[PDB]
Amino acid sequence: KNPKSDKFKVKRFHHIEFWCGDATNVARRFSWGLGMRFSAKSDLSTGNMVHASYLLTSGDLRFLFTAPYSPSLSAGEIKPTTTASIPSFDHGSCRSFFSSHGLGVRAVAIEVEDAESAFSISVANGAIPSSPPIVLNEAVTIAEVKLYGDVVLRYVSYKAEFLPGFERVEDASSFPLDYGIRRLDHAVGNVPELGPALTYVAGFTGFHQFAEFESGLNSAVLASNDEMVLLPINEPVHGTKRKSQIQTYLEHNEGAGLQHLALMSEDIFRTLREMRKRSSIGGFDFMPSPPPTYYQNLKKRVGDVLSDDQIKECEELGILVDRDDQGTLLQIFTKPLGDRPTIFIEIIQRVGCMMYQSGGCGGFGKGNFSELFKSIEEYEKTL
Amino acid sequence: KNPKSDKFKVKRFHHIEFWCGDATNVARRFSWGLGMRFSAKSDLSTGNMVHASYLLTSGDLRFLFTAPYSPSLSAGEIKPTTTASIPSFDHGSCRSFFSSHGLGVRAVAIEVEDAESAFSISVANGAIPSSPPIVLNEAVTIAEVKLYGDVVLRYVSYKAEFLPGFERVEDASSFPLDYGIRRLDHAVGNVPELGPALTYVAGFTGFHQFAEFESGLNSAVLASNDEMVLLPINEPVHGTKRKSQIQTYLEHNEGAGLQHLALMSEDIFRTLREMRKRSSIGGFDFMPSPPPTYYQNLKKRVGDVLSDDQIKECEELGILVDRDDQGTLLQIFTKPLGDRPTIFIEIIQRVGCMMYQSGGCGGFGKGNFSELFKSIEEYEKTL
Ligand SMILES: Cc1nn(C)c(O)c1C(=O)c1ccc2nnn(Cc3ccc(F)cc3)c(=O)c2c1C
Ligand SMILES: Cc1nn(C)c(O)c1C(=O)c1ccc2nnn(Cc3ccc(F)cc3)c(=O)c2c1C
Ligand SMILES: [Co+2]
Ligand SMILES: [Co+2]
Incomplete structure (x- = not known):
């Protein structure tokens, strides 16, 4: 809606x-x-x-x-x-x-x-x-x-x-570097209280809640009329076993701010090959890759969207995959961009929802929390 | 002495x-x-x-x-x-x-x-x-x-x-990058008044004045006992036609500070090839190269130290050459390292004064001011 x-x-x-x-x-x-x-x-x-x-x-x-x-x-x-x-x-x-x-x-x-x-x-x-x-x-x-x-x-x-x-x-x-990044897909804020932040921003823009489908957070996405401007907002979930990364952000950032920028690639495999080549020579590092159980579990979830070779290529690059009821997304996250564990970058490519591609095709990857947890203890058991 | x-x-x-x-x-x-x-x-x-x-x-x-x-x-x-x-x-x-x-x-x-x-x-x-x-x-x-x-x-x-x-x-x-830089040769400060700065530093170190041989500056070099720690200091010369770069530094830096770091290379040609390859892809830019009259004038000044090919290689890379009564130095300067026209880097290699090499062999290139001026109007006349 x-x-x-x-x-x-x-x-x-x-x-x-x-x-x-x-x-x-x-x-x-x-x-x-x-x-x-x-x-x-x-x-x-x-x-x-x-x-x-x-x-x-x-x-x-x-x-x-x-x-x-x-x-x-x-x-x-x-x-x-x-x-x-x-x-x-x-x-x-x-x-x-x-x-x-x-x-x-x-x-x-x-x-x-x-x-x-x-x-x-x-x-x-x-x-x-x-x-x-x-x-x-x-x-x-x-x-x-x-x-x-x-x-x-x-x-x-x-x-x-x-x-x-x-x-x-x-x-x-002006050297014509290009690793395939093409546009900003979404920009995500971290706040202490989601409710008042959402009420304020939706209040003055008229942006509407973008429909979705204990990971440390609660989230909601505000979207423009054609859902091409996408502004997710997170708040922490306290009391958890593992400390909320949203709370860590708020502490090291001295309060609310922008958490991550998601950059759409027209070829996420080329982008990640090029970025990973440069990680240790001045570029950006990526979060540690998921265990091979994660990629072994990819066949059952997206085997109709990605070939075995394309899934193996995701494994080589540490790419994550999630799926909506309408589309599939490939994503990966950098380590923090600077000294503090605050802002990072996400690289993303979306598959589906063709009409041009409608905004937010495939969602934002919230399903990758449980899949990651599921891959981790599965790989521990296989060891 | x-x-x-x-x-x-x-x-x-x-x-x-x-x-x-x-x-x-x-x-x-x-x-x-x-x-x-x-x-x-x-x-x-x-x-x-x-x-x-x-x-x-x-x-x-x-x-x-x-x-x-x-x-x-x-x-x-x-x-x-x-x-x-x-x-x-x-x-x-x-x-x-x-x-x-x-x-x-x-x-x-x-x-x-x-x-x-x-x-x-x-x-x-x-x-x-x-x-x-x-x-x-x-x-x-x-x-x-x-x-x-x-x-x-x-x-x-x-x-x-x-x-x-x-x-x-x-x-x-830890990627094992190496373009040939090997040690810090000297570190240069800019001050409003050279006299009191020299008196202060030589006062508490016992460092002595390192002997030399209107460019906008007056300079003097303080040196340790074996002349391996070299600390030059500059003050501006006011009233000149062209505004002193020392004065520009002091204005944009909000006062005295470190002007340049000189980094010795064991092979300045390799270092400059590698650095210049990267200037427009995240590395450092270099000052504009001297006119070919400068390199045409190099044969008469250092033709006994550098071959014609080695002189041509200096021209390809924009390297400057100066000579003492005891040694020769090759040098080049980067553009400022950050936003302000303040700190920059010098790459240097010294030829001569073998015993190990004694410190400061060839001087610091002060002769390159007049040679540069001489090359500039000569190249204008040739045009
Ligand atoms: C959710 C979500 N909701 N909305 C609207 C989004 O855009 C998102 C995301 O992008 C998204 C989707 C799946 C993920 N799976 N694992 N991790 C681990 C991690 C990485 C860097 C750190 F500093 C700390 C932990 C993620 O961060 C992660 C994110 C951040
Ligand atoms: C002198 C001197 N005395 N002592 C003790 C030194 O170490 C030095 C030097 O290193 C040295 C030697 C020859 C030079 N020839 N041309 N230029 C032009 C220029 C470059 C960057 C700018 F931002 C503005 C102008 C130089 O800077 C230059 C320097 C800086
Ligand atoms: Co995201
Ligand atoms: Co110098």
């Missing part, structure tokens, strides 16, 4: 912005680890005396990395005279965010028809304003409201590359 | 410590860009609730990357009960350093015979104490005094891998 209750016209995920202490080193690490190209910049070389911002792209996926310069470089400026290309940026907010949370997502940006309208309707419907609508070069409008913790939902609308004031990156500095 | 006036026994450079906002991403970028292996760690997985520290090695070169965790993880601790592996670490100092300077060197560490003695004699001779001597696991002693800006000179002495509380990194996570 999809009531299509969006209070304003939402298009697609537009970009994700990381707040960094040094944007250069994070962007270069991510570029190599994920196979994303350097595509735009806004920094001292483009006249920006306020912040350094570097944009990586792979397909339609856009990762922005931003860090503050010394405030002394821009001490003469006022907001009317700012050289910042992102007017919502604030030195104090950025430094406070990174010292509080470490490396993490500041903004989940979605493209909308009219960012000023989206902002007004959101705030009229309970959203906490973060940055009012600002029109950039009479061409693009940006506005921000609080999502959870210190994460903002950023509205972007275009009258008609990335943002005014950003320059395209020269070919010499 | 070398008076050998060291006030305590100094051995070699031991390590360089970067203070980071996220040590993981910087260490992974540097590892790939410079061909350094992950060799030790101290972090949550080793019981350290205070800071994340990752050690990269190439030959005898040791780069340490450290960032703070949330203070809440260690709020119950006191210094007697600390889980920090580096007792001088302070959350507030680290956050203040990185917000003030961005990514940069906090500590230049030298190995000494007796770190407590080195500390006492230094402070008795004018050094500003930063962290008193602390004995780690009855095995290693560490102490720190101020060097310039917020950079400390760290004394390490061993009674008898890296530091107690660090664990060696597992083979799977």
Whole structure:
């Protein structure tokens, strides 16, 4: 059931912005680890005396990395005279965010028809304003409201590359890396209390609950009208034998924030081969693979969707598989992206629900908790 | 002339410590860009609730990357009960350093015979104490005094891998990268006033001035008894046509700090081939190469040291060449390591002064300023 209750016209995920202490080193690490190209910049070389911002792209996926310069470089400026290309940026907010949370997502940006309208309707419907609508070069409008913790939902609308004031990156500095990642599938937040978080966000967006089918969490997924913008939210389950990973996140992150980004691949096998080649040479590590009992149990569950060779290829790469009543998904999770056990990345590919592919085809893999537990004691018994 | 006036026994450079906002991403970028292996760690997985520290090695070169965790993880601790592996670490100092300077060197560490003695004699001779001597696991002693800006000179002495509380990194996570870098040759500071900086440091170390042979700077080099610990210091020259790069550093760094690290290669041609292959895929960029007039002028200056092919190989890689009355050096400079135009790296190889090779063989390349200017207008005229 999809009531299509969006209070304003939402298009697609537009970009994700990381707040960094040094944007250069994070962007270069991510570029190599994920196979994303350097595509735009806004920094001292483009006249920006306020912040350094570097944009990586792979397909339609856009990762922005931003860090503050010394405030002394821009001490003469006022907001009317700012050289910042992102007017919502604030030195104090950025430094406070990174010292509080470490490396993490500041903004989940979605493209909308009219960012000023989206902002007004959101705030009229309970959203906490973060940055009012600002029109950039009479061409693009940006506005921000609080999502959870210190994460903002950023509205972007275009009258008609990335943002005014950003320059395209020269070919010499722009190596065409590509490991197959194509777009952001969903972005997941961790909060202490799911109920009030859901009520707040569904309250100001009109996003509806996306239907699903003791793992340490309770979850729910908010979705736009065509279910292409997907925002899951988790809360911890306390008292459990194993401590909730949601609680660990909240402790090390100093509260609520973005837990993981799920990146759709057009060929998850190629993506994982390329990423795993680079894990120990600057890229990303992956969670430990499931036991072979898990892959021995895959024939009975998805043997009609994946060949034996394709299942063996999942085993080689540590890929997980789950299935809806309507589709199948392949997924795998990285280890945390930075020092703290907080944000990580999921790589995903979805099989089915063809019409284009409908959003969320196959679900989000919640069945992989019990299957993993089931594989673990089975492999212990086989030993 | 070398008076050998060291006030305590100094051995070699031991390590360089970067203070980071996220040590993981910087260490992974540097590892790939410079061909350094992950060799030790101290972090949550080793019981350290205070800071994340990752050690990269190439030959005898040791780069340490450290960032703070949330203070809440260690709020119950006191210094007697600390889980920090580096007792001088302070959350507030680290956050203040990185917000003030961005990514940069906090500590230049030298190995000494007796770190407590080195500390006492230094402070008795004018050094500003930063962290008193602390004995780690009855095995290693560490102490720190101020060097310039917020950079400390760290004394390490061993009674008898890296530091107690660090664990060696597992083979799977430790890929044996190596592009030929072997040790730290020198570490250079920028200050507003050279005179008082020299008087202070030579005052408490007994380091002597290393003899040399309008570029925007005045410089002098302090050296230990065997001239293997080399600490150059620069001040800006104001009024010049082109603005001093030393002044630009001081402005963007918010004052004095470490300007560049010079890393000796056992084969600078291999090192530069390997680094340049990776510049646009996560590694380091290099300054723009000199005009071919520079290499056309190399035959007359070093044609007795380098063959024509070896000179052509310098041209392919953008390497610079300078010569003493006693030796020749090959050198090249990276672009800044992070967002700000502050710290960069120099790769160097020295030819001559065999006895082992004596320190500073060939000088530091100060002659390359006039040669570069001379190449530039010559190439303009040839056009
Ligand atoms: C649920 C779920 N609900 N919604 C809306 C989602 O998007 C999801 C997921 O993506 C999903 C699905 C299956 C999984 N199976 N195992 N693990 C183990 C683990 C990995 C990294 C850690 F730091 C700690 C534990 C997972 O994390 C896991 C996730 C995170
Ligand atoms: C001097 C000197 N004295 N001592 C004790 C040293 O160690 C040195 C050097 O290493 C040395 C030698 C020759 C050079 N020729 N050209 N450039 C251009 C440039 C590069 C990066 C920038 F951000 C701005 C300008 C240099 O920097 C340069 C250096 C830095
Ligand atoms: Co997910
Ligand atoms: Co130098």
